[PDB]
Amino acid sequence: GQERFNRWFLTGMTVAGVVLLGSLFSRK
């Protein structure tokens, strides 16, 4: 069937993931 995805959700999730990863890398 047809499927729809929320691009904003993906972007927000990606941004949040990037922030968490950046913090993790920053903490080292």
PDB file of N, CA and C in Angstrom:
ATOM      1  N   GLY A   1       0.857  -1.214   0.000  1.00  0.00           N
ATOM      2  CA  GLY A   1       0.000   0.000   0.000  1.00  0.00           C
ATOM      3  C   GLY A   1       0.860   1.219   0.000  1.00  0.00           C
ATOM      4  N   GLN A   2       0.226   2.409   0.007  1.00  0.00           N
ATOM      5  CA  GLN A   2       0.970   3.639   0.009  1.00  0.00           C
ATOM      6  C   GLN A   2       1.448   3.880   1.411  1.00  0.00           C
ATOM      7  N   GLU A   3       2.647   4.485   1.542  1.00  0.00           N
ATOM      8  CA  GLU A   3       3.191   4.758   2.846  1.00  0.00           C
ATOM      9  C   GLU A   3       3.644   6.185   2.839  1.00  0.00           C
ATOM     10  N   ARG A   4       3.548   6.853   4.006  1.00  0.00           N
ATOM     11  CA  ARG A   4       3.960   8.229   4.101  1.00  0.00           C
ATOM     12  C   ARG A   4       4.871   8.326   5.283  1.00  0.00           C
ATOM     13  N   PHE A   5       5.878   9.220   5.197  1.00  0.00           N
ATOM     14  CA  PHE A   5       6.809   9.379   6.283  1.00  0.00           C
ATOM     15  C   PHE A   5       6.894  10.843   6.579  1.00  0.00           C
ATOM     16  N   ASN A   6       7.121  11.185   7.865  1.00  0.00           N
ATOM     17  CA  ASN A   6       7.221  12.568   8.247  1.00  0.00           C
ATOM     18  C   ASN A   6       8.674  12.942   8.142  1.00  0.00           C
ATOM     19  N   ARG A   7       9.001  13.779   7.136  1.00  0.00           N
ATOM     20  CA  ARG A   7      10.366  14.201   6.915  1.00  0.00           C
ATOM     21  C   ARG A   7      10.841  15.010   8.092  1.00  0.00           C
ATOM     22  N   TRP A   8       9.952  15.847   8.672  1.00  0.00           N
ATOM     23  CA  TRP A   8      10.337  16.681   9.791  1.00  0.00           C
ATOM     24  C   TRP A   8      10.713  15.805  10.954  1.00  0.00           C
ATOM     25  N   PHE A   9       9.981  14.688  11.143  1.00  0.00           N
ATOM     26  CA  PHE A   9      10.266  13.783  12.236  1.00  0.00           C
ATOM     27  C   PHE A   9      11.648  13.216  12.047  1.00  0.00           C
ATOM     28  N   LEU A  10      11.989  12.837  10.797  1.00  0.00           N
ATOM     29  CA  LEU A  10      13.282  12.251  10.527  1.00  0.00           C
ATOM     30  C   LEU A  10      14.348  13.284  10.780  1.00  0.00           C
ATOM     31  N   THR A  11      14.117  14.530  10.314  1.00  0.00           N
ATOM     32  CA  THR A  11      15.093  15.583  10.494  1.00  0.00           C
ATOM     33  C   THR A  11      15.270  15.857  11.962  1.00  0.00           C
ATOM     34  N   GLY A  12      14.153  15.965  12.717  1.00  0.00           N
ATOM     35  CA  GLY A  12      14.239  16.252  14.135  1.00  0.00           C
ATOM     36  C   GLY A  12      14.967  15.142  14.837  1.00  0.00           C
ATOM     37  N   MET A  13      14.664  13.878  14.475  1.00  0.00           N
ATOM     38  CA  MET A  13      15.312  12.751  15.107  1.00  0.00           C
ATOM     39  C   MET A  13      16.782  12.789  14.787  1.00  0.00           C
ATOM     40  N   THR A  14      17.120  13.095  13.517  1.00  0.00           N
ATOM     41  CA  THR A  14      18.505  13.139  13.101  1.00  0.00           C
ATOM     42  C   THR A  14      19.216  14.230  13.854  1.00  0.00           C
ATOM     43  N   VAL A  15      18.582  15.418  13.974  1.00  0.00           N
ATOM     44  CA  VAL A  15      19.206  16.528  14.665  1.00  0.00           C
ATOM     45  C   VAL A  15      19.439  16.149  16.104  1.00  0.00           C
ATOM     46  N   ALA A  16      18.430  15.532  16.756  1.00  0.00           N
ATOM     47  CA  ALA A  16      18.575  15.151  18.144  1.00  0.00           C
ATOM     48  C   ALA A  16      19.696  14.152  18.271  1.00  0.00           C
ATOM     49  N   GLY A  17      19.771  13.188  17.325  1.00  0.00           N
ATOM     50  CA  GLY A  17      20.810  12.183  17.371  1.00  0.00           C
ATOM     51  C   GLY A  17      22.151  12.842  17.209  1.00  0.00           C
ATOM     52  N   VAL A  18      22.247  13.833  16.297  1.00  0.00           N
ATOM     53  CA  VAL A  18      23.504  14.511  16.063  1.00  0.00           C
ATOM     54  C   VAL A  18      23.923  15.223  17.322  1.00  0.00           C
ATOM     55  N   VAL A  19      22.971  15.894  18.003  1.00  0.00           N
ATOM     56  CA  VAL A  19      23.301  16.620  19.211  1.00  0.00           C
ATOM     57  C   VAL A  19      23.816  15.654  20.250  1.00  0.00           C
ATOM     58  N   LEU A  20      23.120  14.509  20.439  1.00  0.00           N
ATOM     59  CA  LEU A  20      23.543  13.540  21.428  1.00  0.00           C
ATOM     60  C   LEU A  20      24.898  12.989  21.065  1.00  0.00           C
ATOM     61  N   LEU A  21      25.147  12.734  19.761  1.00  0.00           N
ATOM     62  CA  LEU A  21      26.421  12.186  19.355  1.00  0.00           C
ATOM     63  C   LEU A  21      27.488  13.226  19.550  1.00  0.00           C
ATOM     64  N   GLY A  22      27.170  14.498  19.227  1.00  0.00           N
ATOM     65  CA  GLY A  22      28.134  15.566  19.369  1.00  0.00           C
ATOM     66  C   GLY A  22      28.510  15.700  20.813  1.00  0.00           C
ATOM     67  N   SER A  23      27.517  15.586  21.721  1.00  0.00           N
ATOM     68  CA  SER A  23      27.795  15.707  23.136  1.00  0.00           C
ATOM     69  C   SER A  23      28.674  14.561  23.558  1.00  0.00           C
ATOM     70  N   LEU A  24      28.366  13.342  23.062  1.00  0.00           N
ATOM     71  CA  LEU A  24      29.145  12.173  23.410  1.00  0.00           C
ATOM     72  C   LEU A  24      30.567  12.350  22.937  1.00  0.00           C
ATOM     73  N   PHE A  25      30.754  12.822  21.684  1.00  0.00           N
ATOM     74  CA  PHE A  25      32.091  13.002  21.159  1.00  0.00           C
ATOM     75  C   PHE A  25      32.784  14.101  21.920  1.00  0.00           C
ATOM     76  N   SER A  26      32.044  15.175  22.274  1.00  0.00           N
ATOM     77  CA  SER A  26      32.640  16.281  22.995  1.00  0.00           C
ATOM     78  C   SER A  26      33.098  15.804  24.347  1.00  0.00           C
ATOM     79  N   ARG A  27      32.271  14.973  25.024  1.00  0.00           N
ATOM     80  CA  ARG A  27      32.636  14.470  26.330  1.00  0.00           C
ATOM     81  C   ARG A  27      33.855  13.603  26.182  1.00  0.00           C
ATOM     82  N   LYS A  28      33.858  12.735  25.143  1.00  0.00           N
ATOM     83  CA  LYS A  28      34.983  11.858  24.903  1.00  0.00           C
ATOM     84  C   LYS A  28      35.126  10.907  26.107  1.00  0.00           C
TER      85      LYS A  28
END
